Symmetry: D4
Subunit: 137 residues, 8 copies
Amino acid sequence: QFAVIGLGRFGGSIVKELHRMGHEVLAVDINEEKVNAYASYATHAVIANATEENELLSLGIRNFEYVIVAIGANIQASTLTTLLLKELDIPNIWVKAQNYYHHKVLEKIGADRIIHPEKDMGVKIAQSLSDENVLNY
Amino acid sequence: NKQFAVIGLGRFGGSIVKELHRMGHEVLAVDINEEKVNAYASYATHAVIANATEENELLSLGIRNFEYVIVAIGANIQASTLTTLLLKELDIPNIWVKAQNYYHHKVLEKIGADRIIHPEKDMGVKIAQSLSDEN
Amino acid sequence: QFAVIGLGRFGGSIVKELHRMGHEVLAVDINEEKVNAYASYATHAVIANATEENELLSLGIRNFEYVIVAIGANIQASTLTTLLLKELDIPNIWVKAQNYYHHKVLEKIGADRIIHPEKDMGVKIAQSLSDENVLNY
Amino acid sequence: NKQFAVIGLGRFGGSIVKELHRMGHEVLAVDINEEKVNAYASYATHAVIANATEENELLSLGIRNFEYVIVAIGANIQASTLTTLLLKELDIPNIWVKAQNYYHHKVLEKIGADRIIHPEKDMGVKIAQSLSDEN
Amino acid sequence: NKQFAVIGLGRFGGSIVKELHRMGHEVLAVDINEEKVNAYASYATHAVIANATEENELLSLGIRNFEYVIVAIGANIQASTLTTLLLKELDIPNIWVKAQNYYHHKVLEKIGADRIIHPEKDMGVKIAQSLSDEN
Amino acid sequence: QFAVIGLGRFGGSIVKELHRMGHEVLAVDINEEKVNAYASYATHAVIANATEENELLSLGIRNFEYVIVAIGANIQASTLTTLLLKELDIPNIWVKAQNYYHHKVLEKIGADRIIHPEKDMGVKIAQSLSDENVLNY
Amino acid sequence: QFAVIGLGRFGGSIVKELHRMGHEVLAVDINEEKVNAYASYATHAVIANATEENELLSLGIRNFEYVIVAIGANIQASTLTTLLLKELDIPNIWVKAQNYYHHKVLEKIGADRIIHPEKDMGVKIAQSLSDENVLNY
Amino acid sequence: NKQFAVIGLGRFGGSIVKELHRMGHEVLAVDINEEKVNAYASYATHAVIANATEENELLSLGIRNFEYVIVAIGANIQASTLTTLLLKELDIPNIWVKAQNYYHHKVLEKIGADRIIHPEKDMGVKIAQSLSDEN
Ligand SMILES: Nc1ncnc2c1ncn2[C@@H]1O[C@H](COP(=O)(O)OP(=O)(O)OP(=O)(O)O)[C@@H](O)[C@H]1O
Ligand SMILES: Nc1ncnc2c1ncn2[C@@H]1O[C@H](COP(=O)(O)OP(=O)(O)OP(=O)(O)O)[C@@H](O)[C@H]1O
Ligand SMILES: Nc1ncnc2c1ncn2[C@@H]1O[C@H](COP(=O)(O)OP(=O)(O)OP(=O)(O)O)[C@@H](O)[C@H]1O
Ligand SMILES: Nc1ncnc2c1ncn2[C@@H]1O[C@H](COP(=O)(O)OP(=O)(O)OP(=O)(O)O)[C@@H](O)[C@H]1O
Ligand SMILES: Nc1ncnc2c1ncn2[C@@H]1O[C@H](COP(=O)(O)OP(=O)(O)OP(=O)(O)O)[C@@H](O)[C@H]1O
Ligand SMILES: Nc1ncnc2c1ncn2[C@@H]1O[C@H](COP(=O)(O)OP(=O)(O)OP(=O)(O)O)[C@@H](O)[C@H]1O
Ligand SMILES: Nc1ncnc2c1ncn2[C@@H]1O[C@H](COP(=O)(O)OP(=O)(O)OP(=O)(O)O)[C@@H](O)[C@H]1O
Ligand SMILES: Nc1ncnc2c1ncn2[C@@H]1O[C@H](COP(=O)(O)OP(=O)(O)OP(=O)(O)O)[C@@H](O)[C@H]1O
C-alpha cells in the first residue's frame, strides 16, 4: 500500500504516523541500525540499497501505489532511486529534495511531489498562524 | 495590525514570511544579517535588521506589540534560546520556536515556549497524513 | 550537602577541596573515566547524564542544598541541567558559564551564581595584588 | 606609582586590569594586538602595544620599574615563557604567570616564576571554599 | 555550421575544444567561470559565459541549433545532470556527457544521454588497444 | 609480453581489455585488494612495491617489451618506478601523468609515451565527433 | 659517556655515528618503536619520558658528560627536559631548536649548544662549497 | 666569478647564501617568491626572482655559467626534481640538491644529482662527530 525508502527524521517520522493511523507500511534503508529502529512500526522493515535495480525487485516495490523517497544528504541515490522507481511504473512517487538543483532534476525526472521539509513546514506554519486569526480560534 | 513577527529568515523562517504575505497578512521579518533582510523586504510589511538577543534592539521593534513571534533561528541554539527567553520576558502572548535538536526541544519546553517545531519530523507526520488522505 | 555535576578541571578541583576540608560531596559525570578519577575524593562518585530527568532522580539530587553545574564545552547540557535542577526546586544552583551568551541564559534561567573561571580568577588576582600593597604585606 | 604591569589582555589578563582600575590602582596593560589594547585603554593608566618577547620593547616600557608584572599570555606558551624568562632577566621582583597546562606549570616552576595561576583549577578550589563558608 | 557545442571547459572538455579547432571545426565553448572562457576564446568559434543549468541562458546560446552538445561538467554532478536533463528537453539530437562516477553513469543511462564517457576507464581500454596494435 | 603497474580505473581497465583481446598480462600493485580484484583478468596478478628495485626483479620485469606505469595520485612512485624501469632497459615504458609538472619530468626522465587520461580522452572525443561528420556516418 | 634523548632523523642519526665510531651511547625515547629501532646501535636503548624528573633518575642521566636533547615537534618536552637536565647539573647539554622562539628560551634556559639542523647544515654546506674552491680541490 | 648559484631561499638554502657571503664569496640567489628574494638581496651578489622549473627563465640567469648550483627547494619535490633535471640538461658541472624524503633521495641518485643533502640526518652525523672530537 505505502512504501517508504530512507528512514531519517523525515522518512521514519512518516512511517510511524502511517502506523499510528493503522496503515501497513514497508520501510527500507541500507543501514541496518535504521531498519531495526522502526521494525516495530512498519508492516515490514527491510534492509536494502534502493539504487540497486535488483534489490528493489526483491521488495516487489512495483506492487506499491505510493513510494516515498526520503533519502537525505545523498542527492545521488535520491535521484537514482526516483529514476529506477519511475521505470517500475510506480504510480505515485514522492521525493524529499535536498536543495534547489535537486528539486529541478526531480521535477523533470518525473517525481509526482517534491518535499522541502524546511520550506514546506514554513508554509504550513504561516497557514496555521493565519487560521488562528482568520477563522479566529 | 501587529499580529505576526518572524525572527530569523532562513529556509524555514523566511518561507513562512512569504506565505504570510501571499495570504495578505502583514509581517515583521527580522534578521541580524542584512543580506537576508533585503531578500525579503518585498514580502514583509517591515524588514528590520537587528540582533534578537539584544534586549534593547528588541524594544526598538516594539516586539512586545505582537501577538505572535516566531523564532526561526537555526544553527545557533545559543541565540535561539536567549531570544525565546527574552521574548518570554516581554510577556509575548504566543512564541513559537524551531528546535534544532532534542536538547533544544527540551529546554524550550521548560523555557516556556508555546509551540516547538521540528521541520524535519513534523513535516514527516504531515506527509503520513497526506498519503493517508489520498487513499 | 554538596553535589557537583561535571568533573573537569574546574568541577573536579572543587570536589577535592570540598574533601580536603572534610566535607561530603556527591560528584557525578556521564564519562566513567572521570568518575573513577575522583571516587577517592567524593563521598559518592556516580555515573549519569545530568540532562536525564530520571537519572537526576536516581541520585536524589533534590536532597542537596547546593548543586554545582561544572559542565564545560557543552552549552547544551549545562543549560538543560540547570533547567532541570531549577525544577527540582534545588535551593542554590551555581553554574560555570562557557561564554557571554551562556551567562545571559543562565541569569534569566534562574541560576543563583554564574562562574567565569577565567575572568573571575582575574578579579581575584587583581584583588590579591591589591591586598599585597594596600594592607601592605 | 609603577606597581602593577599586566602583559596579555585576554579574558583573564584583561579582567584583572579592570578590577585593578575599579579599585583605584594604576595599571600598565600591554598586548601586541592593537585591537586588544584599544579595548582597555579606558581602564589602564597606560595601554601600550608591544611584543613582550622583544627584549627591547620591554625596555621601551620601563617594565623594570614595576614591582609586579603579570604574564597573562594564553594559547602561546612560546611567548608566555620567553617573556617570563626575559622578565626574570630584568630582576623584576614579582612575576606571576598564567599556566596553559601541566608542562607550562612545570617549566615556570623551574624558570623562576613567583606564582603560577591555573584559572580553571584555582577557581575550582576557590568555589569549594565558598560553598564551605556558605554552610 | 552549428554542429558542435561543448559545455564545461575543464581538462577534458576544453581539451576537446582545441582539437575540434585544430581540425578546422567551429565550436561553441561555454562555462559559467569567465576565466575559463577567456582561456579558450582563441580556440572556439565562440566562447560564451553562462550557467548551463539556467533554462533561459541555454536559449540565449541557441543551443537547440546544435547537432552535438558535450556536457563536460566535472565535480558537480548536480549541474551536469540538470544540464543534460535540460538538453534532453530541447530535443538536442546527440548529447554526450562525462560521468563523474558509477551513479552518475547510471542516471545518465536513464536520463537519456546518448553517450557516457569515463575518461579514466575509457582511455584505459584505449591504451590496451594500442599496446595490442603495437605488437 | 605486457606488464601493467598500478591497478586503478585507468591501469586496471587496460588489463581487462588486454585480457578480453586474448593477451597475457602481468598486473601488479602493492595493495593486495586491488591485486585480487584482477587476478581473473591477468595472466599473473602479483603484489609488490614497484619502487623497490628488488621486487621489480622478483617479477622479471626486465623480460617485458612493454610496461605501463599507471600509478595515480602518487607522483612519487610513478616517477621512481619509471626511473627504475628505465634502468632495467625496458624497451617501451608508458606512464600516466598526474599533472603538468609530472609530464615534464617524465619527458626528460625518458618515458616513451605519457598519458593524460583526461585530456587525451578529449582529443579522442573531438576526433570521434569529427569522424561522425567528415566521414559522415 | 654520551646520552641522546629523542630518536628522530636528527637524534637517531647521531646515535648511529656515535656507534660506528666505536662509542658507547645511551639512546632514549618514550615511543618504544623508536627505541627498538636503535637497540642495535646504542650501548643501551631505554624507553622513558625525559620530562619525568624520576625516569631521568632511572637512567642515571646525571652520570653523563654529554646529553643531547633531540626532541623535535614538541617545544614542550624539549624545553622541560633541558630544564630538568640543567638541574641534574649535566655538564654539557646540546639541544635541537624547533624555531626561533625556541632558540631564545634555550639560550636563556642555559643550553650549551643549540642546533638548527636546517640552517646549521646550510652553513656547513656553504663551508663545503667554499673549501672546494679556496683550498682548491 | 660565477661559481655558486643557490635556488630556493628557505631556512636551508638561504642560510647557505649568507654564509657564502660572510666568507666573501659572490652568490646568485633565486626564488619565485619575491618576498624571499628581497630578504636576501643584501647577502647575494644577485637576488633574482624566477621559476627554476621554467627552462627559459633558467637561461635568463645564465645559470649554465655556474660551476655549482644548489637546489634548496623544500616542500615541493615536484619543482625540486624538475629543476635538478633541467640543470642536468644544461650540463651544469656540480648540482647539489636537498632531498625532502627517501623517495626524493632515490630519484636524485638516478636523476644524476652529484650530492644529496638530508639536513636532518646529515647534521645528526655531524653532531655525532663533534661530541666525538670534544672527548
Ligand atoms: N542507497 C540507499 N538505499 C536505501 N537507503 C539509503 C540509501 N542511501 C542512504 N539511505 C538512507 O537514507 C538516509 C539518508 O538521508 P539522511 O542522511 O539526510 O538522514 P539523516 O541526515 O540521518 O536525518 P534527516 O533525513 O532528517 O536529515 C539514511 O537513513 C540512510 O541510511
Ligand atoms: N541573534 C540573531 N538575531 C536575529 N537573527 C539571527 C540571529 N542569529 C542568526 N540569525 C539569523 O537567523 C538565521 C539562523 O538560522 P540558520 O543559521 O539555520 O539560517 P541558515 O543556516 O543560513 O539557512 P537554514 O535556516 O536553511 O539552515 C540566519 O538567517 C541568521 O542570519
Ligand atoms: N550530560 C552530562 N551529564 C553529566 N556530565 C556531563 C554531561 N556532559 C558532559 N559532562 C561532563 O562535564 C565535563 C565537560 O566539560 P569540559 O569538557 O569543559 O571539561 P574539560 O574540558 O575536560 O576540562 P575544563 O572543564 O577545565 O575545560 C566532562 O567531564 C564531561 O564528562
Ligand atoms: N608576544 C606577545 N606579547 C604581548 N602580548 C601577546 C603576545 N602574544 C600574545 N599576546 C596577547 O596576549 C593574549 C594571549 O592569550 P590568549 O591567546 O589565550 O588570548 P585569547 O585566546 O584571544 O582569549 P583568552 O585569553 O580568553 O583564551 C592575546 O590577547 C594576545 O593578543
Ligand atoms: N552550471 C554550469 N554551467 C556551465 N559550466 C559549468 C557549470 N558548473 C561548472 N561549470 C564549469 O565546468 C567545469 C566543471 O568540471 P570540473 O569542476 O571537473 O573542472 P575542474 O575541476 O576545475 O578541472 P577538471 O575538469 O580537470 O576536474 C569547470 O570548468 C566549471 O567552471
Ligand atoms: N609503490 C607502488 N607500487 C605498485 N603499485 C602502487 C604503488 N603505489 C601505489 N600503487 C597503486 O597504484 C594506484 C594509485 O593510483 P590511484 O590512487 O590514482 O588509483 P585510483 O585513484 O584509486 O583510481 P585512478 O587511477 O583512476 O585515479 C593504486 O591502485 C595503488 O594501489
Ligand atoms: N617526553 C619525551 N621524552 C622522550 N622522548 C620524547 C618525548 N617526547 C617526544 N619524544 C621523542 O622525540 C621525537 C619527537 O621529535 P620529532 O617528532 O620532530 O621526530 P620526527 O619528527 O619523527 O623526525 P625529526 O626529528 O627529524 O623531525 C620522537 O622520536 C619522540 O618519540
Ligand atoms: N619552482 C621554483 N623555483 C624557484 N624557487 C622555488 C620554486 N618553488 C619553490 N621555490 C622557493 O624555494 C623554497 C621551497 O622550499 P620550502 O617550501 O621548504 O621553503 P619553506 O617551506 O617556506 O621554508 P623551509 O625551507 O625552512 O621548509 C621556498 O622559499 C620557495 O619560495
